[PDB]
Amino acid sequence: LSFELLHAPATVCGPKKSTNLVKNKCVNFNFNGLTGTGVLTESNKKFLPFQQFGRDIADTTDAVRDPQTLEILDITPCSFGGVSVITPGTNTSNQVAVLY
């Protein structure tokens, strides 16, 4: 058996059923075998219907087209970045603060 991960629409894989589309919550999505984490929103990107999915400067996933119903959805990561604290010396007090 021969397999290849070519840039082609997915045809043959498991019989696992799909679910209802959900928006405004960042989750893990399995769109035609593409694994990624992000929020699904309505996309303003409108192009000629001849390409499956697109990329960006970062060579990541930003545009998707599910084959069941042809609409374009937007992908962007949710909250990220480091977190720091605000505190004085521990000899005086322990009143600390959280900075985002």
């Binding site: 990561p77 990220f80 480091g82």
Partner: peptide
């Protein structure tokens, strides 16, 4: 702002983090 640095400001123009200056 004085107009000279106004003109100079107009002339001069994802896991990363860009901290703002102090």
């Amino acid at each position: 702002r004085s107009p000279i640095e106004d003109l100079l400001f107009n002339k001069v123009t994802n896991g990363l983090t860009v901290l703002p200056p102090l």
